[PDB]
């Protein structure tokens, strides 16, 4: 009850809720009787403006709004590869079995990672009584033949001495795997942890990227090469090949993992990825194995809730960063970032904010620059020492095919490959 405000206004994706004293900016809330996920983006006395990541049709004035007290976060652990999510880290396959429908039910709460699967956990170099800091690899699970050792990292910003560590065996995600005491208070850690999507995951050191990202395209490899840990943009009109370049890079690049974000783009593009990747094989591990085994998809189709587009992007990069923390070279494909900018523009319009160039919010360029700064080659936070990289490859969809678009102008200012 104390955490329950009431809907006051609803307009498109934007819901203003009243009696919301105690809500924090960019805090996650559950709007309505279906518990639609949303984030607070404005506080005005007791009234909080919320961007809802689901369809708001049918929301009534007076409906309950729960304050979760947490930001938007992703669950990180075994069970991310071969999975397709929806933008707020919901498994679309699961949604399909539970809902038993061809649509995505409104406000459906399903765990990000499968709590039924049992993972073959094997401990690490750390033993009871040792000191463990954030990012330390204290175990490893066998996720699939391609990700043969999914390393269990202590969550960042966690410390203490290992009071208890589980033995080798099969554990579900909810089973306790570690227990660490810091100041007499003992913290229980499992095979997975949550991380906010709007705070980049820490690294020990960001390194200079010097190894090529071999996309398999002669023109890109030869004339305009990208490096592992680099940032690229692909501006073009419709029918130019932004989605085919992205998918070719996903299929054939030398990256150990792929995070493909279908941000505000065709559902059919996600259907063909799901159909084709299981039939394409890679030799990075030394044996033929489907590339789907080392790819994750984050799909927010163009007709899915617009406000979720941003979430999807922030989800994708976070997942990418997570895998970079394991010493892998990840490429995260944002197809398209112009759709995320358009979602921000729509939310800004519903908010009555002063428009910047071409109607976009004045904070768009800063958001893009911050998002692209999350790419790079880095030394993981904990021990043992391991180096990873995140390469962001972003398709830009300039309005009318004109590279004077504000999104293209900001991205070309940010990225290193054009």
């Amino acid at each position: 009850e104390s955490e329950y405000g009431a809907i006051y206004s609803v307009s498109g994706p934007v819901v203003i809720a009243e009696n919301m004293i105690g809500c924090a900016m960019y805090e996650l809330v559950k709007v309505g009787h279906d518990n639609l996920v949303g984030e607070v983006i404005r506080i005005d006395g007791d009234k909080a403006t919320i961007q809802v990541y689901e369809e708001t049709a049918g929301l009534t004035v007076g409906d309950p709004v729960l304050r979760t007290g947490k930001p938007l976060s992703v669950e990180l652990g075994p069970g991310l590869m071969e999975t397709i999510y929806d933008g707020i880290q919901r498994p679309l396959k699961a949604i399909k079995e539970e809902s038993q429908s061809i649509y995505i039910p409104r406000g459906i709460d399903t765990p990000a990672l499968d709590r039924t699967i049992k993972w073959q956990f094997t401990p690490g170099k750390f033993q009871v009584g040792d000191h463990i800091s954030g990012g330390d690899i204290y175990g490893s699970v066998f996720e699939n033949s391609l990700i043969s050792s999914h390393k269990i990292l202590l969550p960042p910003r966690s410390r203490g001495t290992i009071t208890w560590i589980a033995p080798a065996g099969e554990y579900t995600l909810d089973e306790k795997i570690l227990e660490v005491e810091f100041d007499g208070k003992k913290s229980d850690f499992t095979l997975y942890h949550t991380w906010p999507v709007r705070v980049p995951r820490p690294v020990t050191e960001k390194l200079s990227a010097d190894y090529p990202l071999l996309t398999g395209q002669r023109v890109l490899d030869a004339l305009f090469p990208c490096v592992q840990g680099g940032t690229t943009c692909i501006p073009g009109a419709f029918g130019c090949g932004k989605t085919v370049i992205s998918q070719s890079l996903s299929k054939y690049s030398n990256s150990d993992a792929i995070i493909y974000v279908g941000c505000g783009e065709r559902g059919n593009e996600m259907a063909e990825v799901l159909m084709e990747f299981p039939e394409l094989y890679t030799e990075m591990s030394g044996t033929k194995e489907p590339i789907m085994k080392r790819t994750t998809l984050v799909a927010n189709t163009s007709n899915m809730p617009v406000a979720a587009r941003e979430a999807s992007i922030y989800t994708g990069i976070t997942l990418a960063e997570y895998f970079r923390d394991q010493g892998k070279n990840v490429s995260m494909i944002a197809d398209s970032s112009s759709r995320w900018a358009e979602a921000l523009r729509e939310i800004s319009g519903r908010l009555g904010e002063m428009p910047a160039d071409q109607g976009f919010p004045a904070y768009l360029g800063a958001k893009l620059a911050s998002f692209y700064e999350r790419a790079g080659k880095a030394v993981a936070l904990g021990s043992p020492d391991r180096t990873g990289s995140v390469s962001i490859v972003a398709a830009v969809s300039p309005a009318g095919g004109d590279f004077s678009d504000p999104v293209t102008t900001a991205t070309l200012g940010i990225t290193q490959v054009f």
Binding site: S11, Y103, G264, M270
Partner: protein, 471 residues
């Protein structure tokens, strides 16, 4: 079985609140005050002083205030005596298999002089986004009969591919031809046609009705007719009443639906009108900034789904203002849709029919629908080579415009010959001529035989051995 018994809870009476509390009328929009628990996307019935009932959609709710867009207009509505009844639901359409062979207003009211649709269900016209995991990638090629489409812009069943045209071009004839001759390249029956008309002139409606009636497909066609003189805002729901019908026929009745959405440009005009009433920050050339998402909610209602043997193939028809493909309507449509058939005014003036310019055209699902086991193994190479040679011929014609014919190379003259023969033989087809994709790929090789085999650099050497000399 007893699945349909879930229809229960339809036996329930829900009294409705009547509000004599209109506060203002601003164009398409009417403001209601003192509303009790307003519901965001609700549908309301405004009874006017003269007794006629219009419908409106709650666009915004704020405390006790509700903003309603009235589809049939706000002329004749007055702050003083108009009443508004709140139904407590979103706009729904009554759906049954009996909608086929019926003609409805742009708002869904039958205009056959027939009965109301005896509903088998009430479906929310906004529908829901299909789960991307639940989709099937379209790979079954539909033979449209047109060689400009079937050889080079191969349409797959379940594809959403508009026709980009202009005011005077024969896009209606091309769409009617496709509806008349469409069918699988490898069949294993007929398409059910759902036709939505937004702001079309009476001539277009008469033409399409006559063409469906002659072809015998009216018995399985459902028409939603909003005319050029019908309410403008109503056009915002006409494509959703149609698609909601298609989704019912395709995904719940296992039919294969071909959806024609004529003049999406008038839909965009109505969207711009509503945006202007809303006092919104207009987008490029005045259209709303959210027009991309609004169009996506229409175009993305197509394709195939797992475990269901129906499909929806959309063919929106889209008039380009000033023939400009960079206009927001065609530009956004091309970013949302899986290809475009480009009807060209320059080809139309030159007497060619169908005046389809293949260079600005695309079929994003052709790369998967064509090939060895699906069409013939020459198809993808023969289309790529045709595109390359057609572009070279256009360049050579432009060059000839300056330096004259005498200065052209041998390859440029071969490309000019190819250009004329390609446009006046392969592109040109009868308004009632249907060509098999194997007949069109035999016409393509004859054009490609104008050139030495060593100039066909885009056709793989194994395909050029098997099919170049063939004869």
């Amino acid at each position: 079985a007893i699945n349909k018994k879930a229809v229960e809870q339809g036996f329930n009476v829900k009294p409705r609140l009547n509000y004599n509390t209109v506060s203002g009328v601003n164009g398409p929009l009417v403001i209601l005050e003192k509303v009790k628990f307003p519901r965001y996307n609700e549908i309301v019935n405004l009874t006017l002083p003269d007794g006629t009932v219009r419908q409106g959609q709650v666009l915004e709710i704020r405390g006790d205030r509700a903003i309603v867009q009235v589809f049939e207009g706000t002329s004749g509505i007055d702050v003083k005596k108009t009443t508004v009844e709140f139904t407590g639901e979103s706009l729904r359409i009554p759906v049954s298999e009996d909608m086929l062979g019926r003609i409805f207003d742009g708002s869904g009211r039958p205009i056959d002089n027939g009965p109301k649709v005896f509903a088998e269900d009430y479906l929310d016209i906004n529908g829901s986004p299909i789960n991307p995991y639940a989709r099937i990638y379209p790979e079954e090629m539909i033979s449209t009969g047109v060689s400009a489409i079937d050889t080079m812009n191969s349409i797959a069943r379940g594809q959403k591919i508009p026709i980009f045209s202009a005011s005077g071009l024969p896009h209606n004839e091309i769409a009617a031809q496709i509806c008349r001759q469409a069918g699988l390249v490898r069949p294993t029956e007929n398409f059910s046609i759902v036709f939505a008309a937004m702001g079309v002139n009476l001539e277009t409606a008469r033409f399409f009705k006559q063409d469906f009636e002659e072809n015998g497909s009216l018995e399985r066609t459902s028409l939603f007719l909003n005319l050029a003189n019908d309410p403008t805002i109503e056009r915002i729901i006409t494509p959703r009443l149609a698609l909601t019908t298609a989704e019912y026929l395709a995904y719940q009745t296992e039919r294969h639906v071909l959806t024609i959405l004529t003049d999406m440009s008038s839909y965009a005009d109505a969207l711009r009108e509503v945006s202007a009433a809303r006092e919104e920050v207009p987008g490029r050339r005045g259209y709303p900034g959210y027009m991309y998402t609004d169009l996506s909610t229409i175009y993305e209602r197509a394709g195939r789904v797992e475990g269901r043997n129906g499909s929806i193939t959309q063919i929106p028809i889209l008039t380009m203002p000033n023939d400009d493909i960079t206009h927001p309507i065609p530009d956004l449509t091309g970013y949302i849709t899986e290809g475009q058939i480009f009807v060209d005014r320059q080809l139309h003036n030159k007497g060619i029919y169908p005046p389809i310019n293949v260079l600005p055209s695309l079929s994003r699902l052709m790369k998967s629908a064509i090939g060895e086991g699906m069409t013939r193994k020459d198809h993808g190479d023969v289309s790529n080579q045709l595109y390359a040679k057609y572009a070279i011929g256009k360049d050579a014609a432009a060059m000839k415009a300056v330096v004259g014919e005498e200065a052209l190379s041998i390859e440029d003259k071969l490309s000019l010959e190819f250009l004329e023969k390609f446009e006046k033989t392969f592109i040109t087809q009868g308004a009632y001529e249907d060509r098999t994709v194997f007949e069109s790929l035999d016409q393509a090789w004859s054009l490609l035989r104008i050139y030495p085999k060593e100039m066909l650099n885009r056709i793989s050497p194994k395909i050029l051995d098997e099919f170049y000399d063939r004869a």
